[PDB]
Structure 1
Amino acid sequence: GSELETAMETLINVFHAHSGKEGDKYKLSKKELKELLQTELSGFLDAQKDVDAVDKVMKELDENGDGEVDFQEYVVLVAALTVACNNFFWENS
């Protein structure tokens, strides 16, 4: 159980605890997930100046408004917010 593998495990726990809402186990409504991503990463979206980056993730919700997201999507969007900030470190002088 390395930290690398454990890091992902954390995404499973949180994803589940929230999957108990309207869904059942692996099911999760977009309405609930929409707040989830920002609920755990409320700081990131606060340290990111990229307005276009958040816009893409915001509108993306309307694209999959199907009423249900996907775990694979939960892990991709949560990170998309982080990388949308680290860029601050690497930049031209």
Structure 2
Amino acid sequence: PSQMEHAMETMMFTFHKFAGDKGYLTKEDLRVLMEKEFPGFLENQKDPLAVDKIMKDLDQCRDGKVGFQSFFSLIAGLTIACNDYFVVHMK
């Protein structure tokens, strides 16, 4: 498998790891997930409510559930901001 395939499988497997058989994430799943995968990101926001800011606009419908596609829009937003950073600076 190519690198991208591995990347994709990883994202897919990470979602299911923290969402469980319920097949979706609650705020708390999301919060744990961010804590295990993006700890420096959270600590650089001096806000005990970052997961709440983030949960808010993932949950367009207010059902407390975040599915895979919404999960992917979170990863998309971060990776995009990292890339912008990267382009402006690191090369």
TM class, shorter-chain normalised? 0.5 to 0.7
Aligned match of 2:17 = 17
Unaligned 5+ runs, structure 1: 49-53
> Is the contact between residue 18 and residue 30 of structure 2 (CA under 8 Å) also seen in structure 1?
no
Aligned-partner residue type, residue 30 of structure 1: T
* TM-score, normalised relative to structure 2: 0.63
* Equivalent pairs, count: 83
Aligned match of 2:27 = 31
Residue 43 (structure 1) aligned with residue 31 (structure 2): no
**Alpha-carbon spacing, 1:79–1:47, altered in 2? closer, same or farther (3 Å):** farther
Aligned match of 2:48 = none
Stretches of 4+ aligned residues off by more than 4 angstroms:
45-48
> Is the contact between residue 18 and residue 33 of structure 2 (CA under 8 Å) also seen in structure 1?
no
Aligned match of 2:87 = 90
**Alpha-carbon spacing, 1:43–1:37, altered in 2? closer, same or farther (3 Å):** same
> Is the contact between residue 30 and residue 68 of structure 1 (CA under 8 Å) also seen in structure 2?
yes
> Is the contact between residue 34 and residue 61 of structure 1 (CA under 8 Å) also seen in structure 2?
no
> Is the contact between residue 47 and residue 85 of structure 1 (CA under 8 Å) also seen in structure 2?
no
Match of 1:76 among 65, 73, 78: 73
Task: Using the TM superposition, give the Cα deviation of residue 5 of structure 1 relative to its aligned residue in structure 2, in angstroms.
Answer: 0.9
As a proportion of its length, which structure holds more helix? 2
* TM-score, normalised relative to structure 1: 0.62
With a CA cutoff of 8 Å and minimum separation of 6, indicate the structure with the bigger relative contact order: 1
CA distance in 1 between partners of 2:72 and 2:59 (Å): 18
What's the RMSD between the two structures over aligned residues? Answer: 3.1
Identity of aligned residues (%): 47
